[PDB]
Enzyme design. Structure first.
Site, PDB file in Angstrom:
ATOM      1  CG  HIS B  77      -3.325  88.161  55.094  1.00 26.97           C
ATOM      2  ND1 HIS B  77      -2.066  88.098  54.072  1.00 26.97           N
ATOM      3  CD2 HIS B  77      -4.189  88.538  54.285  1.00 26.97           C
ATOM      4  CE1 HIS B  77      -2.342  88.776  53.044  1.00 26.97           C
ATOM      5  NE2 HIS B  77      -3.637  89.004  53.118  1.00 26.97           N
ATOM      6  CG  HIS B 244      -8.624  96.484  49.603  1.00 25.71           C
ATOM      7  ND1 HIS B 244      -8.601  95.991  48.451  1.00 25.71           N
ATOM      8  CD2 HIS B 244      -8.064  96.022  50.529  1.00 25.71           C
ATOM      9  CE1 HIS B 244      -7.774  94.773  48.699  1.00 25.71           C
ATOM     10  NE2 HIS B 244      -7.512  94.966  49.955  1.00 25.71           N
TER      11      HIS B 244
HETATM   12  C1  HEM Z   1     -10.036  89.496  46.859  1.00 27.21           C
HETATM   13  C2  HEM Z   1      -9.660  89.792  47.921  1.00 27.21           C
HETATM   14  C3  HEM Z   1      -8.521  90.703  48.487  1.00 27.21           C
HETATM   15  C4  HEM Z   1      -7.397  90.895  47.686  1.00 27.21           C
HETATM   16  C5  HEM Z   1      -6.801  90.299  46.397  1.00 27.21           C
HETATM   17  C6  HEM Z   1      -6.526  91.371  48.409  1.00 27.21           C
HETATM   18  C7  HEM Z   1      -4.887  92.146  48.036  1.00 27.21           C
HETATM   19  C8  HEM Z   1      -4.072  92.908  48.775  1.00 27.21           C
HETATM   20  C9  HEM Z   1      -2.914  93.203  48.461  1.00 27.21           C
HETATM   21  C10 HEM Z   1      -2.323  92.842  47.315  1.00 27.21           C
HETATM   22  C11 HEM Z   1      -2.853  93.919  49.443  1.00 27.21           C
HETATM   23  C12 HEM Z   1      -1.230  94.713  49.310  1.00 27.21           C
HETATM   24  C13 HEM Z   1      -0.147  94.092  50.372  1.00 27.21           C
HETATM   25  C14 HEM Z   1       1.230  95.058  50.329  1.00 27.21           C
HETATM   26  O1  HEM Z   1       1.469  95.028  49.095  1.00 27.21           O
HETATM   27  O2  HEM Z   1       1.264  95.427  51.386  1.00 27.21           O
HETATM   28  C15 HEM Z   1      -3.641  94.441  50.302  1.00 27.21           C
HETATM   29  C16 HEM Z   1      -3.633  95.199  51.224  1.00 27.21           C
HETATM   30  C17 HEM Z   1      -4.988  95.230  52.198  1.00 27.21           C
HETATM   31  N1  HEM Z   1      -5.724  94.479  52.431  1.00 27.21           N
HETATM   32 FE1  HEM Z   1      -6.523  93.234  50.853  1.00 27.21          FE
HETATM   33  N2  HEM Z   1      -6.994  91.893  49.423  1.00 27.21           N
HETATM   34  C18 HEM Z   1      -8.267  91.238  49.615  1.00 27.21           C
HETATM   35  C19 HEM Z   1      -9.399  91.369  50.551  1.00 27.21           C
HETATM   36  C20 HEM Z   1      -9.298  92.113  51.709  1.00 27.21           C
HETATM   37  C21 HEM Z   1      -9.895  91.982  52.992  1.00 27.21           C
HETATM   38  C22 HEM Z   1     -11.139  91.001  53.212  1.00 27.21           C
HETATM   39  C23 HEM Z   1      -9.333  92.688  54.107  1.00 27.21           C
HETATM   40  C24 HEM Z   1      -9.940  93.240  55.447  1.00 27.21           C
HETATM   41  C25 HEM Z   1     -11.361  92.904  55.380  1.00 27.21           C
HETATM   42  C26 HEM Z   1      -8.395  93.557  53.550  1.00 27.21           C
HETATM   43  C27 HEM Z   1      -7.721  94.313  53.920  1.00 27.21           C
HETATM   44  C28 HEM Z   1      -6.525  94.920  53.497  1.00 27.21           C
HETATM   45  C29 HEM Z   1      -5.644  96.028  53.908  1.00 27.21           C
HETATM   46  C30 HEM Z   1      -6.188  96.747  55.326  1.00 27.21           C
HETATM   47  C31 HEM Z   1      -4.831  96.260  53.275  1.00 27.21           C
HETATM   48  C32 HEM Z   1      -3.597  97.345  53.610  1.00 27.21           C
HETATM   49  C33 HEM Z   1      -2.099  97.083  54.020  1.00 27.21           C
HETATM   50  C34 HEM Z   1      -1.580  98.253  54.617  1.00 27.21           C
HETATM   51  O3  HEM Z   1      -2.047  99.280  54.866  1.00 27.21           O
HETATM   52  O4  HEM Z   1      -0.189  98.010  54.998  1.00 27.21           O
HETATM   53  N3  HEM Z   1      -8.195  92.842  52.045  1.00 27.21           N
HETATM   54  N4  HEM Z   1      -4.712  93.722  49.903  1.00 27.21           N
END
Ligand code: HEM
Ligand code: HEM
Ligand SMILES: [Cl-]
Ligand code: NA
Ligand code: NA
Lengths: 712, 712
Positions: B77, B244
């Site tokens: 982010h 993810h």
């Molecule tokens: C289409 C692109 C993406 C969408 C729509 C998306 C959406 C989301 C959403 C909705 C969450 C959950 C937030 C929560 O409720 O805590 C999440 C978590 C996360 N995303 Fe994505 N994301 C995207 C791309 C990425 C990318 C590019 C990365 C890293 C390279 C990433 C890594 C993460 C990780 C590590 C979490 C987990 C957070 C946790 O364990 O607390 N995401 N993402």
């Protein structure tokens, strides 16, 4: 584009502390206006202005072939924004050429007046500021029409962006009172710090209160607004009748003819506004206020015809061509000349607010005296015109040029000359050691020097430690100054002074004003030593002690701190959150957000709080100069909640055990809440920050001690 | 309090040119972050960050007992606000800790992540920025959970107030498209320069476009927004699938439980927000997005389980406990661990935007290749993570510390190393005399050097004269660069280069990049001489010439100037007025208002206008360096009006005779209209200002020539 101010319209605004940066300033960082002004040929400027008075431009023809009246209104409006409550507004920064003042309805067509002066500004360049020129032009207008001015000082440096000023909360220009954002409550009580009856007016509505053409009721608004601009009854009468000795108003046709103010106009208007579709749009057809009044038989010559007309006729309520309320002399001859047609004459006319000078009983006595004695009128006007146009220039040390009046005026808060050798570095070391050996504490020494120096405000350059007025009425009795603690510290310092001055040769002596500051410097050095750190706090001697007789106690009332975050002080409850009042106080002290942050964190741990309140005192080593305020505030082991008793007071409890560790105010906790202030607190609360904290604290301490030192 | 923005909400905002002043900065004006970072024990920081990963705090307990997932999202982010259109956003200024980004819905509970890092930031102080720490923490989270990163550069200096970014015009968080401030028009065209589908999101809506759960339509938004953040299909799949592989989403209860974002919360919240009334409000009970998805059977360890699940099950539309759209594997066993309860297991789940990677045909082929070749997935993710997190850091010369990858990547716009002696002052005087003896005009030399240097933007530190990319595709073809004139200048300069390099011994040679800037300097020297002024323009050699193969043509398209007020150029008709585009360009060039003013006045009289337009060329001595632009613009003898054909073009006519004197654009006349810009024009238009104009112009000229010289 949606901004942070759209999303979070109530968040603190720190931008007001970061105006007037080297970035926005087109002059070199080495540019000194005083050095440039002192080489100006002022006599040559005044000859150019004198020729300008009778050189009509066809894009804005001169009434009676003379611009004098227009330029007097221009200079009166430049000075007329001044409020005593905060010292903001006035002529001292040339703010009439920026938003919003350049587009206030009461400044309509003063855009033409400023444009007429561009050729002279262009000729003399940086050697005369716009701020100085606007006032000078007013003086030369008066001189050219037979009026002897009291004098003139140069030294108003130009500024390069709008002052951040609270002008009121109304969202409509000239909104009548009683609206959703009314500046009036109770029995017509105008909210501090405002000094005008309507948004975009200088003082009052020339028709009468909210348009009601009653001269008696108008008189009330005149007295209230003029008192709030530092003018008493005699000064007020002298100014209004003095101004309205010259020129005319403009209301030749309906107001709906007049287009956009300068800030709303098209790019092709090139900084001008109020373009009128009425006949020629200018000269004989001009519309400015919507009133059409010419006061005297010689609008381009000083006379006593204003009072001759005021008292020599009875007055009839009538309407301008624009439909404004105004008054005409019953049964009068056409004795007043027309501005453009030498074959037309008019009856005497007056504003509601002019008739105030006859129908208010207190004004009538002064107006009758001025009528019977026009030499008294001319002297009062000259002194009032000086005071009006210089009220925000600060100490007499700032006054430049060959026309500065030699007479010292009570309103100038005068400092006596120094006629004797000053203490040197070894003397200052000796006096600091005697102060510390007396048994005065860090907290007493820092509190007293803070109380003395922190009355300064950069808005009108009033206040500061110079003068030692903390020992006089009324400062010595202000609740924030802790009068009984203050009296004990001053008694000890005065005995140290007497002993030092007694022992001296060669006429060398130290003012109490210097010793109060030098004592505070000793307190800060001792605090640093307490923390295990040896520092020298800088100190510049040369302050003098003013007398009670040289102190106007009434004028000094506006400098009382009723809110001082740096002492965790609030006299009562206010509309405005305490953290907003802290930033307002930092702006008046000329502090940046970093300077405000380090100063407040240091003052908390030195014991500067009024009444020795524990609020914000986040240390177990009070009277030691450490970054403890920041390390403890930012400790996530502590959890903060508002008290049941008082929602403006917070308890900090161990998050694990619930043990009470601290209490704090909104002023303390904003440094851990506001995202930009917390970022600053982090720098000072870091493990590598002890030496930076002490250095930065000493620097901003010395800055505050020296705010009023224009003598350097 | 009513402000200038309230009265005149369409006036130009100059405050964006005067941010990041020494006033708001708590560090000394001498503070060098690079020097502080170089002394950091980076090994020690990484050990502390490894320890933190599994040190759960009660106030925000770690999912699965490891904060790694939360920290990877935090870093993603930080980097994910970046737009290629203007280079604004990205991780490079640590802006996630300020408004508005600290409070965006997509950044919910990242306030908890930043707070977890305060003890480490405190311990290392000024030797590691927040901006570097957010990315390094992401890197350590990946390494902790078994993924080898491609490397890490330090050198992101901290900033001390919010960046002025256009994030869009919606006045409602997360507004769906087609509203009164829609960022979409036509066939789902996203307005430039935005790179997100809704106000307060990073890229796309995880439920699907405007909340419609169609993975195929979601794929279209993903492709568009990632492209606008400099990522192709391969990088996009690698980043989403990589991210993810870790952690989980949070939606344990209805979103209505969640309270004020940080900028809206009480002072007692001490900088945190989204306080939740649902059960414990944290941990098992956490609500962030409103979705409840855990992707893999080992959320705290690198695995190949994301693509195994994606392809291995068929997916059924369902609802989170907050009501959000998400997907569950048909007929799957409970194989996914619970974050808190060892006795609970869950079926596999996916977001709509995860399923995009399978159901978009172009993504499906990459996803299948990554599923079959996990080593290709790991390498692609590592390279994309490095790019994501370094995209806005600028030339490799800014990269600090011992983990910088040696591999030179096309996306870095690489400059070859200089391997030869540079030209000295004697050589530079010889080359300038040869340039002036060639017959190249002042207008040709200034235009070419301006075209080369003025591609720089401080937002992502892309562009500038280093690399001589003006001679390559696509810069040599850009309309603003006048391709035919440019070709002719470049040919002449290359002949001078070939002859100088051919006469040298000892390996000394000059780059075309250097000679273009030196030839510009000669042009400015010649212009000064034309005006009877003896001027030397500073020059620093050491630029190198990049190849076409070191210049990504598609990435270079976003630097094409479609508006450049400094050459009076507008490529088409925009909804944003040209004077707003001029200030936008000044901000990207790092110019103050006074710098923008002086530069534009100078360029107009030197003949830098595209197509040799007469617009704003207010001189009778073109190619002479004078303040004529200011003196003629401010001349009240001239009246201005918009033309019949074109309301954006203005004619200046003698007020007296009606004769046409000049024409100008909005960019020309705004200097005569805006109250702050006019105050600057007046300084440079004064009788005393000819030398000051020349010296200020030379200073800002050299500043633009050096913008990309981090090698110094
Ligand atoms: C289409 C692109 C993406 C969408 C729509 C998306 C959406 C989301 C959403 C909705 C969450 C959950 C937030 C929560 O409720 O805590 C999440 C978590 C996360 N995303 Fe994505 N994301 C995207 C791309 C990425 C990318 C590019 C990365 C890293 C390279 C990433 C890594 C993460 C990780 C590590 C979490 C987990 C957070 C946790 O364990 O607390 N995401 N993402
Ligand atoms: C209650 C206080 C005052 C009120 C309500 C007031 C009101 C006005 C109004 C409405 C105008 C006409 C503007 C126009 O249409 O052009 C005006 C003109 C003028 N005022 Fe005042 N005024 C006040 C005090 C002062 C003071 C203190 C001075 C100077 C000492 C001053 C000097 C003038 C002059 C010289 C003009 C004539 C401008 C010209 O010839 O173009 N006024 N006043
Ligand atoms: Cl200068
Ligand atoms: Na003031
Ligand atoms: Na950026």
């Amino acid at each position: 584009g949606t901004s942070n101010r759209d999303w979070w319209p109530n968040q603190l605004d720190l931008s007001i502390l970061h105006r007037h940066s080297s970035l926005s300033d087109p002059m070199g960082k080495d540019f000194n206006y005083a050095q440039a002004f002192e080489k100006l040929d002022l006599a040559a400027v005044k000859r150019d202005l004198h020729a300008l008075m009778t050189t009509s431009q066809d894009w804005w023809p001169a009434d009676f072939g003379h611009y004098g009246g227009l330029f007097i209104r221009m200079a009166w409006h430049s000075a007329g924004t001044y409020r005593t409550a905060d010292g903001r507004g006035g002529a001292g920064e040339g703010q009439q050429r920026f938003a919003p003042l350049n587009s206030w309805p009461d400044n309509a067509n003063l855009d033409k007046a400023r444009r007429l002066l561009w050729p002279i500004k262009q000729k003399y360049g940086r050697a005369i500021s716009w701020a100085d020129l606007l006032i000078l032009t007013g003086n030369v207008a008066l001189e050219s029409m037979g009026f002897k001015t009291f004098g003139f000082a140069g030294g108003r440096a130009d500024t390069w962006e709008p002052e951040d000023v609270y002008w009121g909360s109304e969202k409509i220009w000239l909104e009548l009172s009683g609206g959703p954002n009314s500046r009036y409550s109770g029995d017509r009580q105008l909210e501090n710090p405002l000094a005008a009856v309507q948004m975009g007016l200088i003082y009052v509505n020339p028709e009468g209160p909210d348009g009601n053409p009653d001269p008696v009721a108008a008189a009330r608004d005149i007295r209230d607004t003029f008192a709030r601009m530092a003018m008493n009854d005699e000064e007020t009468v002298a100014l209004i009748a003095g101004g309205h000795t010259f020129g005319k108003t403009h209301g030749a046709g309906p107001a709906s003819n007049v287009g956009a103010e300068p800030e709303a106009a098209g790019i092709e208007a090139q900084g001008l506004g109020w373009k009128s579709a009425y006949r020629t749009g200018k000269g004989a057809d001009a519309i400015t206020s919507g009133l059409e009044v010419t006061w005297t038989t010689t609008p381009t010559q000083w006379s006593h015809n204003f009072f001759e007309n005021l008292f020599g006729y009875e007055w009839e309520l009538t309407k301008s061509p624009a439909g404004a309320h105004q008054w005409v002399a019953k049964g009068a001859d056409a004795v007043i000349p027309d501005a453009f047609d030498p074959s037309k004459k008019h009856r005497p006319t007056m504003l509601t607010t002019d008739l105030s000078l006859r129908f208010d009983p207190a004004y009538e006595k002064i107006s009758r005296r001025f009528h019977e004695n026009p030499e008294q009128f001319a002297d009062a006007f000259a002194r009032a015109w000086f005071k009006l146009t210089h009220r925000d220039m600060g100490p007499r040390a700032r006054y430049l040029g060959p026309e500065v009046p030699a007479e010292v005026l009570l309103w100038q808060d005068p400092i006596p000359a120094v006629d004797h050798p000053l203490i040197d570095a070894a003397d200052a070391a000796e006096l600091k050691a005697k102060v510390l050996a007396s048994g005065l504490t860090v907290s007493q020494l820092v509190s007293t020097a803070w109380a003395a120096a922190s009355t300064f405000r950069g808005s009108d350059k009033r206040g500061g430690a110079n003068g030692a007025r903390i020992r006089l009425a009324p400062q010595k009795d202000w609740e924030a100054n802790q009068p009984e603690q203050l009296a004990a510290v001053l008694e000890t310092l005065e005995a140290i002074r007497t002993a030092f001055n007694g022992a001296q040769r060669g006429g060398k002596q130290v003012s109490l004003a210097d010793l109060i500051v030098l004592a505070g410097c000793a307190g800060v050095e001792q605090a640093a030593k307490n923390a295990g750190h040896a520092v020298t706090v800088p100190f510049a001697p040369g302050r003098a002690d003013a007398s009670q007789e040289q102190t106007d106690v009434e004028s000094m009332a506006v400098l009382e701190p009723v809110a001082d975050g740096f002492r965790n002080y609030l006299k009562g409850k206010y509309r405005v959150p305490a953290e907003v009042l802290l930033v307002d106080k930092a702006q008046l002290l000329t502090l940046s957000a970093p300077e405000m942050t380090v100063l407040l964190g240091g003052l908390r741990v030195l014991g500067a709080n009024v009444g020795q309140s524990r609020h914000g005192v986040f240390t177990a080593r009070e009277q030691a100069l450490t970054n403890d305020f920041f390390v403890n505030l930012l400790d996530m082991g502590t959890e903060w909640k508002p008290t049941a008793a008082d929602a403006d007071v917070f308890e900090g409890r161990d998050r694990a055990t619930g043990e009470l560790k601290w209490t704090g105010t909104r002023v303390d906790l904003v440094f851990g809440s506001h995202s930009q202030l917390r970022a600053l607190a982090e720098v000072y609360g870091s493990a590598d920050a002890q030496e930076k904290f002490v250095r930065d604290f000493v620097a901003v301490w010395n800055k505050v001690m020296n705010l009023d030192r224009f003598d350097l």
